[PDB]
Design a protein around this nucleic acid. Sequence first.
RNA 1: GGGGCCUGACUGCGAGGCCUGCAAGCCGAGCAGGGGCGAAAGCCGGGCCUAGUGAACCGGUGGUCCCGUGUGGAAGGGCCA
RNA 2: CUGGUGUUGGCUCUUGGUCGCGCCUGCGUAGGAUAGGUGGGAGCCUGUGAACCCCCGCCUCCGGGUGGGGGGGAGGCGCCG
RNA 3: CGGGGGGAACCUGGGGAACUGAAACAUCUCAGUACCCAGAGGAGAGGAAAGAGAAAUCGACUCCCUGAGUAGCGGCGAGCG
RNA 4: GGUGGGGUUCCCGAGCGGCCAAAGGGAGCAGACUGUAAAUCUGCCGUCAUCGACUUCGAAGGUUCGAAUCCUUCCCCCACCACCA
Lengths: 135, 97, 146
Amino acid sequence: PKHGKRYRALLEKVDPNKIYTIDEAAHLVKELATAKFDETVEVHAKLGIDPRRSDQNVRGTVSLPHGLGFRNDKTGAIHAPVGKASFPPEKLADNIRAFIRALEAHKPEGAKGTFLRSVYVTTTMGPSVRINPHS
Amino acid sequence: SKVCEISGKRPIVANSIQRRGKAKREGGVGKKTTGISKRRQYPNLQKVRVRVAGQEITFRVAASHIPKVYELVERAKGLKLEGLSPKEIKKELLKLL
Amino acid sequence: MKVILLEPLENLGDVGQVVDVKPGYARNYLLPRGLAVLATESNLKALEARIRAQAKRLAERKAEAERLKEILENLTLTIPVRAGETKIYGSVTAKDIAEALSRQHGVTIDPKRLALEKPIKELGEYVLTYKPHPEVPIQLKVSVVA
RNA sequence: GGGGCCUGACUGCGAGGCCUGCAAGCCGAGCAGGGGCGAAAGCCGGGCCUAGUGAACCGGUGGUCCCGUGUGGAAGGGCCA
RNA sequence: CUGGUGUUGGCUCUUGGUCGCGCCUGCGUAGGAUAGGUGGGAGCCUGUGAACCCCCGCCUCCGGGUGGGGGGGAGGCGCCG
RNA sequence: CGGGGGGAACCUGGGGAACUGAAACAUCUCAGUACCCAGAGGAGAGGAAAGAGAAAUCGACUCCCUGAGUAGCGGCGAGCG
RNA sequence: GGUGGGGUUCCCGAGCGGCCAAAGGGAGCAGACUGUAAAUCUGCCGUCAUCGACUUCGAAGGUUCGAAUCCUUCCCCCACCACCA
Ligand SMILES: [Mg+2]
Ligand SMILES: [Mg+2]
Ligand SMILES: [Mg+2]
Ligand SMILES: [Mg+2]
Ligand SMILES: [Mg+2]
Ligand SMILES: [Mg+2]
Ligand SMILES: [Mg+2]
Ligand SMILES: [Mg+2]
Ligand SMILES: [Mg+2]
Ligand SMILES: [Mg+2]
Ligand SMILES: [Mg+2]
Ligand SMILES: [Mg+2]
Ligand SMILES: [Mg+2]
Ligand SMILES: [Mg+2]
Ligand SMILES: [Mg+2]
Ligand SMILES: [Mg+2]
Ligand SMILES: [Mg+2]
Ligand SMILES: [Mg+2]
Ligand SMILES: [Mg+2]
Ligand SMILES: [Mg+2]
Ligand SMILES: [Mg+2]
Ligand SMILES: [Mg+2]
Ligand SMILES: [Mg+2]
Ligand SMILES: [Mg+2]
Ligand SMILES: [Mg+2]
Ligand SMILES: [Mg+2]
Ligand SMILES: [Mg+2]
Ligand SMILES: [Mg+2]
Ligand SMILES: [Mg+2]
Ligand SMILES: [Mg+2]
Ligand SMILES: [Mg+2]
Ligand SMILES: [Mg+2]
Ligand SMILES: [Mg+2]
């Protein structure tokens, strides 16, 4: 297999067809860490911009509410750390809603079409969880 | 008679308008007519052969109403006779009123 | 275009089903060949009628089937034969067992529904199984001095 | 003809006249606002002057806010350029 | 004359579009490198069968990339350089 | 049992011009006029709101007056209304 | 007025992100071959110039480690469509 049975176990936990709430997500992401040390949790989004242009970029700095304990690439996706997998389910939910509303701020005018096209909450070694960034 | 034996649709008279120029809606000065003339529109009339009693009965119909011809065979009870007719199906068996 | 099927069609559907087909196929093939009929509410009602009169008279079968079955698992049929010992001179056939009901206990069975498969010779405790469709074992003992 | 500053090739108007069939064309002091050059008086609303031009209709575009088909909008007009 | 569509149906083979999901896709000798981008990341992956020879696919800058069954039966990558 | 054909004009329905006007002419006008056809009948048609249209409003249809040459319509022309 | 194309060494012309002096054709210069003209063939060929170094791809900026390539705009040509009171 491309993944160990350690991961294969995690691939039965998610129906990627379902669009989860962050609240559904932040809780179900705790079953998503089989790694023997503490995983890091990531929030990914593909963006409504054409990055090839100078004026369509998204970058800033962020201090996450619950502390550590972002910029777009050239393909228009974006990634930053929201925290650690050790954080409590409610301490993740506020850090997810922290990054989501953080990006919306930075929307360039020339952004054509929806700013968050897809948002997947994942973990460092985890599968993809298709979620609703608006919940 | 280019006419529907079910609906009664018959040819109608329609003008044919030759328009030129750019719509005002599209920021042109607006359209002009370079001609209007009469023409007919026909009903899209088609044959339907249907077997009722022992007999083969043919309707001239608007394609629109072709189903009705088949609902019309669906009430079939009292004719063992002929020809002819029936077409005793027809108007009386249509709405009866 | 929805049509009621009058025979099984090798995909499409099989009898009595409502399958939806191209009106061309319907009007110029199926209908005129009797292989189908229109899904009219009048004819969608006729089907639904005749759907009920099947699964009714099929609970008429099971009516007096598991009815009778429940009377014949609670009965033992004793037939006397001239046995000598453990070999009957005569034999008990299905048609016999039949008369052994119509006489003793006053009940009638097929007999052709018995599943004896060649006549009983000799004796003992017997259990055969009866019919139509899910059904009953009968218990009859062949005994001596007739 | 040369040079230094500047951009009045302003906005709001306009006494009164030239011309004149109409429509148009033309000249214009002077007020207000805000400016430019000059120490100042003052000049400046294009160019020594007389040609370099085209009614109205229909549309484009930028405004502004005026109308907005029961009511809020909108659609679409108007007004100004 | 002609495109669409009605009348107008059965069975097929063949494709193009797009959306989705699964999966591979990529090289300056230069970092030992035969590295698509950016996150997170020193750690996982594994005797639920590894390095590796052996047939086998397809790709190939022909080096390798690289799956398919197994013989195979504990190792192999990474920070560290 | 009924139809058929006729009737001055009037009526409805199916069809439907052109001169002319625009001081040319094509949209537009003449005009749904003339005329042809079918039919009704002493009339014919229409008629009892899937209506008006700004009022918590009117209340079938026809006809007259008025609203009104208004609202509009319009090579925004002639002109229609 | 719109959409689609383009712009490159003297003319043409492809044109690539892992650098391409940037393929090639022709012209031109120098070479061999010579009845004439040519054909064929060799080097020169953005430039300084010594390897190699330095500009350069319509223009200005920008992306990036990297621009003849991607991007915003400007500009001009080609093309096609539409419109005109
Ligand atoms: Mg037409
Ligand atoms: Mg037919
Ligand atoms: Mg229709
Ligand atoms: Mg239809
Ligand atoms: Mg169809
Ligand atoms: Mg005056
Ligand atoms: Mg003043
Ligand atoms: Mg001064
Ligand atoms: Mg003055
Ligand atoms: Mg005019
Ligand atoms: Mg208002
Ligand atoms: Mg309204
Ligand atoms: Mg309104
Ligand atoms: Mg408006
Ligand atoms: Mg990579
Ligand atoms: Mg009569
Ligand atoms: Mg008469
Ligand atoms: Mg008429
Ligand atoms: Mg008629
Ligand atoms: Mg008439
Ligand atoms: Mg005329
Ligand atoms: Mg004329
Ligand atoms: Mg005239
Ligand atoms: Mg005249
Ligand atoms: Mg004339
Ligand atoms: Mg008229
Ligand atoms: Mg008559
Ligand atoms: Mg009357
Ligand atoms: Mg009447
Ligand atoms: Mg009536
Ligand atoms: Mg009129
Ligand atoms: Mg010579
Ligand atoms: Mg010689």
